[PDB]
Amino acid sequence: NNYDGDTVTFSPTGRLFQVEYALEAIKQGSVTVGLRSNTHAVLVALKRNADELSSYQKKIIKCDEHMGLSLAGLAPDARVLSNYLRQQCNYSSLVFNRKLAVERAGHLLCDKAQKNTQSYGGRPYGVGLLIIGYDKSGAHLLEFQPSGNVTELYGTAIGARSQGAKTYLERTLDTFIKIDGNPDELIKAGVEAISQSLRDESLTVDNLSIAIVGKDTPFTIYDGEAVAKYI
C-alpha cells in the first residue's frame, strides 16, 4: 500500500511487496514442468503464442552441455539470468576444467537475485526458472524464485495452473523416480503431468516443448515434429 514503492522498503508485517509483485508475474506466465529419475532429468514446457499468426514463445534455454532451464514470467529477465549461468558454467570449465555443479548453479542465481532486492534503484527479477542437470552426483532438478529462494526437488511445476501438475507429480513420485535407463518413458510421465494443468487447449505439435539431460545424454531440446511422438 504505502510500502510497495520500491524494493528497499519493508512492510509493517515484514513483507517485501515488490518481490511479491515480481512473484505474481510468474503466476501469469505459461505452465512448465520439471521432473527427474536417477539417470535422467526432463523439462516439459507449454509454449504460449500472441495469436494464430504469431510464433510460440520459446521457454527452454541451454546453459551448458550438461545443464539448462525452462522459464516462466518475464522472458528478458530469464535471458539475463541464463546468460549469467552460461558464463559461470563456462568459468568453471576454463579455469578449473570442471563441470559446474547444479547445486552451485542454484547458489549463484540466489545470490544474484538477492542483491536486486536490498538496493535502491534496481528491481527484482520477474521470472521463475526450473533448472535441470546431470553432474558428478547424478541427476538434479532445481526451482528458482526471484525472491532468491532456490529449492532442489524430485519434481515440480511453475506458471499458471501449475498446482494441477504439482499434485500429479506428488502422487506419481514413487513411479517416475525409478524410470532409470528409459528416456521416452520419463518424458511420457512429464507430458502426462503437464496435461493436468491444461484447460480447453490441448498439446499440439508446435505448442509442446520438451528437453532432456542424463547419463549418456547431453542437454538437448525437442520442438516441432520431434515431439509428435509424445502426443
Residue 52: phi and psi, rounded to 5, are: -60, -30
Task: Determine contact, residues 157/33, Cβ cutoff 8 Å.
Answer: yes
Per CB under 8 A, 202 contacts other proteins: no
On the 0-12 / 13-18 / 19+ scale of CB atoms within 10 A, 24 is exposed
Residue 160: phi and psi, rounded to 5, are: -70, 135
Work out how close the CB of 9 gets to other proteins at its nearest, in angstroms, rounded to a whole number: 7
Longest dimension (CA), the chain: 55
Work out how close the CB of 39 gets to other proteins at its nearest, in angstroms, rounded to a whole number: 16
Is residue 136 classed as helix, strand or coil in its secondary structure? coil
Binding region for other proteins (CB under 8 A) out of 151-159, 185-193, 206-214, 223-231: 151-159
Binding region for other proteins (CB under 8 A) out of 39-47, 112-120, 196-204, 206-214: 112-120
Per CB under 8 A, 97 contacts other proteins: no
Of 57, 182, 195, 207, the one binding other proteins (CB under 8 A) is: 57
Per CB under 8 A, 201 contacts other proteins: no
Task: Determine contact, residues 22/146, Cβ cutoff 8 Å.
Answer: yes
Give the residues lining the site for other proteins (CB under 8 A).
2-18, 21-28, 49-55, 57, 62, 73-76, 79, 86, 90, 94, 107, 110-111, 113-115, 117-124, 126, 147-149, 151-156, 166, 169-170, 173
